[PDB]
Design an enzyme around this catalytic site. Structure first.
Site, PDB file in Angstrom:
ATOM      1  CG  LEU A  44      -7.999  44.253 -27.890  1.00 35.96           C
ATOM      2  CD1 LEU A  44      -8.213  44.575 -26.423  1.00 35.96           C
ATOM      3  CD2 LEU A  44      -7.890  45.575 -28.676  1.00 35.96           C
ATOM      4  NE  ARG A  46       1.137  36.782 -33.489  1.00 31.34           N
ATOM      5  CZ  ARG A  46       1.395  36.895 -34.794  1.00 31.34           C
ATOM      6  NH1 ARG A  46       0.429  36.744 -35.687  1.00 31.34           N
ATOM      7  NH2 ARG A  46       2.630  37.163 -35.215  1.00 31.34           N
ATOM      8  CB  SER A  50      -3.374  33.695 -23.399  1.00 34.11           C
ATOM      9  OG  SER A  50      -2.452  34.761 -23.587  1.00 34.11           O
ATOM     10  CG  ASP A 155       7.583  37.719 -19.260  1.00 35.79           C
ATOM     11  OD1 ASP A 155       8.661  38.079 -19.837  1.00 35.79           O
ATOM     12  OD2 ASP A 155       6.566  37.230 -19.849  1.00 35.79           O
TER      13      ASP A 155
END
Ligand SMILES: [Zn+2]
Ligand SMILES: [Zn+2]
Lengths: 329, 195, 201, 327
Positions: A44, A46, A50, A155
């Site tokens: 789904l 990148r 992770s 974030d």
């Protein structure tokens, strides 16, 4: 030597009142499940740290989302696990289903609840005025909860806010860069994405708090009700503040650094220059005239401030006139 | 004066390898955990990045040969490594499937184990989805771990358009125009057991 | 030295076994072959070492054609011969030596293979290799075999060999290939989804 | 030479319509070969190879005989005979006739019989067992002769035994031929050990009697436990082996009776031998299989003169089978 210490205005001492096991993530014991329970289906997204795959749990036939952490540091992996467990069950926070690893590779993976992915390319042209007021209230529910638990996301950005428009569902994901707030602690100024960094990160002010998330929340609101993505577009960190100085003025910026005794680096003095404070009505045109209102421009103005103590807290933000339309009904 | 990366990939038997970008290797973060897998990590990394430095020179060279391979298997999973391997895959640098009813489908490299020294490099065909040993004996000494256990499966997950349609026809065994009753291997397989 | 001995000693012709001349001199075993090969009379003479009429003294263009004729004839005899108890007994000696090569599939653990034809008609397909363990056909590893016709070995030679000697059938593959990405199996729902994205394309 | 004729069923084929005996005119009704799939191989050697197969349409076991390239005349021949005798007592049933498109090669599909190795049966064989099974061969031979057909290849491998169900079948009618009174036939027939004296001396005008000789050799092989009985090396020696048992005396009375000219190769090798009594072949390992009834039955079977051998029906009436009648 120089800088003046700062405090959070709400939930300042929730971490110092809670036991050791809560905030100390290095002491957290990870409880591993069974990795053969999960079988990958598609990729789904990148990530820097992770790799994301949609997977299917073969024990109950349920869909799950897998976040395979690329090798970082044992602290940062423990940090994201602990934070996710603490916030679990909270409104609009991503529920961590399970943690698994591969005994050959030694690389760990995080198993989430399957949230339905609606892509920004479709929701952008659909997004109405009430839509923004609804979903912005949902992010606030997520933020007021994690701030109440003594955690800052660090974030907040549209990539870390999953929207399921078909079921009007919202989740605040990606807690890799989240951290516990201890009053008086200095933190790293290299946290958020450049477009969503607050003035305190750019000027090297290390003693920030929950209010950092609120600045980022503004740079999101300014992106949607003005239809300009991102709002403060800088090609580097030095340029980013210049962009902020061209809107909010240089005068309030100099008032910010003087109040806390923050000293800017040599290369900042000239390129910062001088700019006056321009009104929010300047950015409004026909493409976003239906998303903007006197309630919206007032709410943004109390969000995007130089001083972190002067910004709206997550709870005060929810009680704004801008949300009377959505609050209950 | 030719770089070590292009020298290594240039060598015979190393046709499977793609040239890893320098900036990927220079980015300290990508090599996390590799400092405890290889001996003489400090000198080996310099010898890959063409930086300045007894049979010690032989041991550092083996370590750098091992070091590059473990970078390679991390690199080919990324979108930059995939695009480089996709280029090689499109020219048939890896070889073609031995099964008749795949019709010379181009293959991709795969290791059976991620741990070095357990198995050599094998070949994966996306059409039949089985694994094969490289026909040429030059690839009989390259370690499967320098390619990974999940490289091909990642490539089709990033680029799903590259998956071929299933074999159109099957191998149908025939003696004098008669098919063979699978009851008849069950009967053949005993007579060898019973034996 | 014998012609049959010469042909089998050539490069690329490792798959061929030396046919007994008892079999070739027996007219009965060659029923129908006289209308499949050109120059049948002269082709059989060269195969059986019978001196060719003191002909081809200086016919280099004509000697070449009889050589292709004798090559096609012998090959056609060969395909029939390896079905009889003597032809099989000769191939079984070769199969034990590993003359035909070993299976390319990983989980057959280098299984010794057998020669097989996809078609019994000359000029339709080249020689392929049959693996008794995975029961599938493969393209020969060396290019020296890509120029040998499949019809010279027959469609049902391997199948006949295991009916005659049932004991030579190896056990099924003990292990099977399971794909793993970061130590995770691949769901088959996930190729169905991959196979479209290539169609839809 | 003096012409000869059959005693029983002499003109049976001549009173029938042409369609029956004229095998060259028979139209082969082809089946669909995809219905049958091979399981395991049974036998080989002759003009065919035998496989056990399975009929996927009804899941039944069948025996598939794959004929090699012989004459089209011979394949018509076997097909007409196997269709004409079909349903008869102990006669093998032909279920289908199939063909492979590419190779052109034909195959015969028979009904599956459960054969048990003549080896795993040879030892267990009792006196009553031989009397039972010899009688079941006689049922098959009497029927085929009445239909006007001689088998021409009667031997142990052409007789299938299912001891478990007490079931017997006479197979392999590749060398079988129609009888027409006074026709000269090929002597190159029933393998050498089971050849009659008329085949070895080149008397071409034989009849159903030939089968009764071959049957004698089967009886001699079973009751004396000697396989085969008359163990000749070649065709010439075969008659020598027969001559050492039945005596040269009766052999010369046979060739004079029909004016048959012996090959000048027999001139001395045949020699001068007397009749040896049948009690001589009996010893301690086959004693339980020999009776006074058995020897008289054998003696009446194995004779040089073919017009003096017991007919299939007359053989069934013999005192040897009185313990077998049993309804
Ligand atoms: Zn393949
Ligand atoms: Zn195989």
């Amino acid at each position: 030597s120089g800088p003046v210490p700062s405090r959070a205005r709400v939930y300042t001492d929730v971490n110092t009142h809670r036991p050791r096991e809560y905030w100390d993530y290095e002491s957290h014991v990870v409880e591993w499940g069974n990795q053969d329970d999960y079988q990958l289906v598609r990729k789904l997204g990148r990530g820097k740290y992770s790799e994301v795959f949609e997977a299917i749990n073969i024990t109950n036939n349920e869909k799950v989302v897998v976040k395979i952490l690329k090798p970082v540091k044992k602290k940062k992996i423990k940090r994201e696990i602990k934070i996710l467990e603490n916030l679990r069950g909270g409104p609009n926070i991503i529920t961590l289903a399970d943690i698994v690893k591969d005994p050959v590779s030694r690389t760990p993976a995080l198993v989430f609840e399957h949230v339905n992915n609606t892509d920004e390319k479709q929701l952008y042209q659909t997004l109405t005025d009430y839509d923004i007021r609804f979903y912005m209230y949902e992010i606030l529910k997520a933020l007021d909860y994690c701030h109440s638990m003594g955690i800052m996301h660090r974030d907040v950005k549209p990539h870390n806010v999953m929207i399921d428009h078909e079921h009007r569902k919202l989740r605040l994901i990606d807690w890799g860069l989240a951290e516990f707030y201890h009053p008086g602690q200095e933190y790293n100024v290299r946290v958020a994405s450049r477009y969503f960094k607050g003035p305190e990160l750019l000027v090297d002010y290390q003693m920030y708090d929950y209010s950092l998330d609120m600045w980022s929340l503004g740079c999101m609101l300014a992106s949607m009700i003005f239809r300009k993505e991102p709002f403060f577009h800088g090609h580097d960190n030095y340029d980013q503040l210049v962009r902020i100085a061209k809107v909010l003025g240089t005068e309030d910026l100099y008032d910010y650094i003087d109040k806390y005794n923050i000293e800017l680096d040599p290369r900042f003095n000239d390129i910062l220059g001088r700019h006056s404070r321009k009104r929010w009505e300047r950015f409004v045109h026909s493409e976003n005239q239906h998303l903007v209102s006197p309630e919206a421009l007032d709410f943004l103005d109390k969000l995007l401030r130089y001083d972190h103590q002067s910004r709206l807290t997550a709870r005060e933000a929810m009680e704004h006139p801008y949300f009377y339309t959505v609050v209950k009904d | 004066e030719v770089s070590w990366i292009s020298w290594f990939c240039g060598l015979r038997g190393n046709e499977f390898f793609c040239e890893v970008d320098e900036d990927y290797i220079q980015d300290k973060f990508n090599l996390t955990g590799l400092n405890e897998q290889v001996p003489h990590y400090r000198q080996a990394l310099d010898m890959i990045l063409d930086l300045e430095p007894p049979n010690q020179s032989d041991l550092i060279e083996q370590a750098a040969e091992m070091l590059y391979g473990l970078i390679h298997a991390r690199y080919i999973l990324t979108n930059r490594g995939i695009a480089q391997m996709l280029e090689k895959y499109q020219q048939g640098d890896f070889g073609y499937c031995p099964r008749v009813y795949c019709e010379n489908q181009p293959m991709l490299p795969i290791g059976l184990s991620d741990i070095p020294g357990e198995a050599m490099v094998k070949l994966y065909c996306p059409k039949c989805m089985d694994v094969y040993t490289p026909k040429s004996s030059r690839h009989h000494h390259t370690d499967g771990a320098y390619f990974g256990t999940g490289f091909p499966h990642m490539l089709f997950m990033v680029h799903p358009e590259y998956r071929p349609k299933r074999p159109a026809n099957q191998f149908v065994p025939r003696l004098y125009g008669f098919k063979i009753h699978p009851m008849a291997y069950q009967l053949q397989l005993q007579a060898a057991s019973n034996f």
